[PDB]
Design a protein around this ligand. Structure first.
Ligand SMILES: Nc1ncnc2c1ncn2[C@@H]1O[C@H](COP(=O)(O)CP(=O)(O)OP(=O)(O)O)[C@@H](O)[C@H]1O
Ligand SMILES: [Zn+2]
Ligand SMILES: [Zn+2]
Lengths: 138, 56, 119, 56, 116, 158, 98, 214
DNA sequence: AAGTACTTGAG
RNA sequence: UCGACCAGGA
DNA sequence: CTCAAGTACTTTTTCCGGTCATT
């Protein structure tokens, strides 16, 4: 109960089986392009790629899944800071706009409040885990 | 007819036992699939076949 | 493959070649960190897969009522207590081999009469 | 159905009606027949316009 | 012209196949292995560049399959089986008697598959 | 089939093989990128016997073209059953790659007899890492080993 | 069907508060590589946190609903092969007695 | 020897079909000439090393006595084959000027892989005469010999004129054969030419249709 | 859903 | 006296 | 200046009482 949010998040796996370097992007409400997941994680707070890895893969004895994450880490690598990630949501105007979308329109169930940035990040990773899970045919 | 019924009932039975055989054999990884089919696809044909032979 | 991360900033490690001493190094592009590669293997493909068949064999596997029980005695503890699933690999191509987990030793053994498996 | 254990490929499990109509159907047999029967009404409805447009 | 230079290296392998010649005595020297090197090397020149590529890998399959043992030891002793036919043989036949068991298994069981 | 071969089941088997389109992808188990800095000597002890019967014999100008080459090696294991069933030889496979990439890629391979079937590749002539990953894509998905393009799963019928 | 009903919709906070007080580690403090077997707990498709031994927690809730303290309509599932525990206070679910 | 002979078989296979095409087109070639064997084929056009020379294969054929009765204006044709897989603008002019001086009415050019877009845009440069391009691989098999392909027959200006009279037809009212059509190409069919197609019927025994060119 | 019939865009 | 939805028939 | 992909468009069987709003 609360208007009844029509917003649906799509987490996509670009490229097919046999296509070199498969990237994972996600469509966020009210921002036209589908931005790489590593940028989202950095925009949420998780900045080192390996803390971002730890959010998707819950086992570090699973190289098959991690190898599938390697190109996505490379894609996101252009942006290394949280503020530089919020900016990559098109200054100061595009940064507050970004800040607002992740709170209000990105995963509005769970919470729309504030500091729950971690909760949304683990959830994002859960979705990405369940995505790569059918990609491996597991 | 009564005896005819027993005859029908055991026709099903002998065909269900014929399935069980092909099932536990395919579980024991001994089956060989006829081209353009998985072991699974090839197995399922046999099941369907024994049970349709049976009904008829 | 089993790749490492750059200490100090836990970022991904990228390869670099030390053409002088002809050895592989793992360089960091989020700083000045470097480290000798252990293995000469940098990347692995694996088209034909054998990993995903024994998927989710938690301790509570024997508690699942939705699972079937059999009479097959254990190869190590020798208990006639079983819970078995089909090859958990969700590919069309997959075979219907059974994977029996014992309700005592909690060790997995198959019905396969072709391969000398140890996983 | 939730009345079966997992990885059951047996005639009974994947919808084999061992019974005659005179004898009567088991609840599981009844439900499986019910799914198969519904497929008939759908195909008659789906492919009836497609066939009609073909004539036109 | 430059082929003759390459032909030299070809003989040098059947010369060590001396190190293959050892278990012929251990069940059922460096001089006859030099003579038997020329027994095959010139016989492969016969098989090749006829009337008027192939050759290079032919020598490999002979060395690799004859090196074998203790499965091809049975096929290697029957050699000292003629050394004339062995040249035009190549591949699936030069294989182990233990391998031509699985080769029969695969080929004879796939014949029941693609015959629908 | 040809009129004078109608019932010859063996003639059919030959065509069956001659038309069914086979890609390297179908006979490969896995591909690996190894950093083997010296071409003459291999870090992999399994590939010891491979370099031996290939460097000695294939002495046909392969010294200056090349004595390196590329330190980055692409190594791929093939399946005996896949190779046997879809009738093939390491020599057959190896020469196709060798004629797809011509003299821009140095190809070597293990013999049919060997317990592990392998094909070793090196570039000829900065960022070569990804440059080689592109070479394996053209090798698995763009190479024809046997048969006619667009033709799949061919079956015999009496 | 004759016996089937549709869930009217319950409140998830009295179960959220229950869970945390019964061994639920909050997601805000999850150490994924330290405890990598941990069963993940979802209340109406909201990942709240994880539980170290799902077996005993499960029966606490199962017997808690059967007692009448958890609403009888509130459906809870234990996916052992997936290490997951989903709970539904949701309005719209069709249930049947057994 | 291995895959050397596969190019050879194919070249001879194509030669036979080109022979058949010219024969069926109306020109004078014998079945004894067509059925020319492979071992004999090699003996004539294969070089000192067994490599076939396509320059030698090139030949001229003249109209049969019966052809001159139906279509008298039908002139002799020249068939050339090139040893260059990619046929240049230099070689094409050597062929084009051959027909222009020798006043040939028609000329078939059999190429290996391709012809320069430069060279191929010199075909209508010599009227009244006409040129026809054909790929070797296409000519390996005589498509006209297939089960499903009935006998198409070229109608004379008068045969055609008569057909339209007797069926009270406008040219449009006739079923059409495309210029690009494999059989239309085999018979060097020109826009407006009519073919009498004799097919076999499960109903009449024999039924004959007609097709106007595109 | 599957054509068509175009723009839009890379090499 | 106008046409939209819904529910039905073979 | 070729050709891959994104863009938009147009179809979807036949006949045969009630209730709503508004014309
Ligand atoms: N949606 C539809 N559109 C057009 N025609 C239909 C139709 N539904 C039924 N019909 C007509 O009705 C005929 C058959 O339908 P029914 O008469 O209701 C079955 P039945 O013949 O009484 O018994 P059966 O079910 O044993 O065949 C069809 O062949 C068709 O002519
Ligand atoms: Zn660093
Ligand atoms: Zn045990």
């Amino acid at each position: 109960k609360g208007s009844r949010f029509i917003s649906t998040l799509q987490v996509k796996l670009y490229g097919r089986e046999g296509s070199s370097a498969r990237t994972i992007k996600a469509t966020l409400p009210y921002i036209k392009q589908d931005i790489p997941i590593v940028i989202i994680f950095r925009a949420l707070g998780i900045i080192p790629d390996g803390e971002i890895l730890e959010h998707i893969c819950y086992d570090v004895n699973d190289w098959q899944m991690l190898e599938m994450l390697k190109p996505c880490v490379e894609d996101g690598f252009v942006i290394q800071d949280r503020e530089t990630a919020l900016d990559f949501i098109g200054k100061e105007k595009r940064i507050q706009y970004a800040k607002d979308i992740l709170q209000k329109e990105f995963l509005p169930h769970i919470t729309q409040l504030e500091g729950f940035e971690s909760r949304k990040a683990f959830f994002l990773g859960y979705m990405i885990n369940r995505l790569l899970l059918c990609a491996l045919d597991r | 007819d009564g005896p005819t019924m027993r005859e029908i009932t055991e026709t099903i039975a002998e065909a269900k036992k014929k399935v069980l055989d092909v099932t536990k054999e395919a579980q024991a990884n001994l089956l060989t699939a006829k081209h353009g089919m998985t072991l699974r696809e090839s197995f399922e044909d046999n099941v369907v076949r024994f049970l349709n032979e049976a009904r008829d | 493959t089993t790749f490492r991360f750059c200490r100090d900033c836990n970022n991904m490690l990228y390869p670099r070649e030390d053409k002088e001493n002809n050895r592989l190094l793992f360089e960091c592009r989020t700083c000045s960190y470097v480290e000798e590669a252990g293995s000469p293997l940098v990347y692995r493909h694996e088209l034909i897969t054998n990993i995903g068949e024994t998927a989710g064999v938690v301790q509570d596997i024997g508690s699942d009522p939705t699972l079937p029980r059999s009479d097959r005695e254990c190869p190590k503890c020798h208990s006639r207590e079983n819970v078995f699933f089909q090859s958990q690999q969700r590919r069309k191509d997959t075979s219907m081999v059974l994977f029996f987990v014992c309700l005592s030793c909690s060790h997995i053994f198959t019905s396969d009469q072709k391969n000398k498996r140890t996983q | 159905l939730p009345h079966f254990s997992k990885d059951d490929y047996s005639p009974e499990s994947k919808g084999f009606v061992e019974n005659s109509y005179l004898r009567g159907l088991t609840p599981q047999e009844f439900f499986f027949h019910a799914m198969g029967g519904r497929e008939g009404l759908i195909d008659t409805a789906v492919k009836t316009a497609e066939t009609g447009y073909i004539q036109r | 012209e430059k082929e003759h230079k390459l032909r030299y290296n070809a003989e040098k392998m059947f010369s060590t196949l001396s190190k293959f010649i050892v278990p012929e005595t251990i069940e059922a020297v460096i001089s006859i292995s030099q003579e038997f090197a020329h027994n095959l090397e010139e016989e492969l020149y016969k098989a090749c560049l006829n009337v008027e590529k192939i050759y290079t890998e032919k020598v490999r399959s002979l060395y690799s399959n004859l090196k074998d043992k203790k499965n091809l030891e049975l096929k290697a002793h029957v050699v000292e089986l003629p050394l004339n036919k062995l040249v035009n043989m190549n591949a699936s036949e030069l294989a182990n008697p233990d391998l031509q068991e699985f080769k029969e298994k695969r080929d004879k069981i796939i014949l029941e598959n693609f015959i629908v | 089939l040809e009129p004078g071969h109608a019932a010859d089941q063996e003639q059919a088997k030959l065509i069956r093989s001659a038309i069914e389109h086979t890609t390297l992808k179908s006979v490969t188990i896995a591909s690996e990128i190894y950093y083997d800095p010296d071409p003459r000597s291999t870090v992999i002890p399994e590939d010891e016997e491979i370099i031996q019967l290939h460097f000695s014999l294939l002495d046909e100008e392969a010294e200056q073209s090349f004595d390196q080459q590329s330190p980055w090696l692409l190594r791929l294991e093939l399946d005996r059953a896949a190779m046997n069933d879809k009738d093939l030889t390491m020599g057959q496979v190896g020469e196709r790659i060798k004629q797809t990439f011509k003299n821009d890629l140095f190809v070597i391979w293990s013999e049919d007899n060997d317990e592990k079937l392998i094909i070793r590749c090196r570039v000829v002539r900065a960022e070569e890492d990804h440059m080689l990953k592109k070479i394996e894509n053209t090798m698995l998905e763009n190479i024809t080993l046997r048969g006619v393009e667009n033709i799949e799963r061919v079956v015999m019928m009496k | 069907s004759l016996m089937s009903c549709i869930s009217v919709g319950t409140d998830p906070m009295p179960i959220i508060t229950f869970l945390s007080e019964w061994g639920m580690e909050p997601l805000e403090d999850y150490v994924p590589h330290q405890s990598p077997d941990a069963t993940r707990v979802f209340v109406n498709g909201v990942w709240h946190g994880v539980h170290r031994n799902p077996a005993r927690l499960m029966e606490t809730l199962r017997t808690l609903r059967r007692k009448g303290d958890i609403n009888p309509e509130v459906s809870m599932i234990r996916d052992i092969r997936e290490k997951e525990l989903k709970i539904f206070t949701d309005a719209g679910r069709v249930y049947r007695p057994l | 020897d291995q895959e050397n002979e596969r190019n050879i078989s194919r070249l001879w296979r194509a030669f036979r079909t080109v022979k058949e095409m010219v024969k069926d087109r109306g020109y004078f070639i014998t079945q004894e000439e067509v059925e020319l064997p492979l071992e004999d084929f090699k003996a004539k056009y294969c070089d000192s090393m067994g490599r076939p020379q396509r320059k030698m294969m090139s030949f001229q054929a003249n109209p049969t006595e019966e052809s001159i009765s139906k279509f008298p204006d039908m002139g002799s044709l020249w068939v050339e084959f090139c040893d260059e897989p990619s046929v240049g603008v230099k070689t094409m002019k050597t062929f084009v000027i051959h027909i222009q001086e020798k006043n040939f009415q028609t000329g078939i050019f059999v190429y290996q892989n391709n012809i320069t877009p430069s060279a191929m845009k010199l075909v209508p440069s010599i009227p009244p005469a006409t040129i026809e391009t054909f790929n070797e691989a296409a000519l390996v098999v005589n498509i006209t010999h297939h089960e499903l392909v009935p006998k198409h027959i070229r109608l004379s200006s008068d045969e055609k004129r008569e057909l339209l009279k007797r069926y009270r037809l406008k040219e449009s009212q006739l079923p059409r054969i495309q210029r690009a059509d494999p059989v239309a190409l085999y018979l060097g069919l020109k826009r407006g030419e009519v073919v009498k197609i004799i097919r076999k019927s499960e109903t009449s025994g024999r039924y004959a249709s007609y097709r106007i060119c595109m």
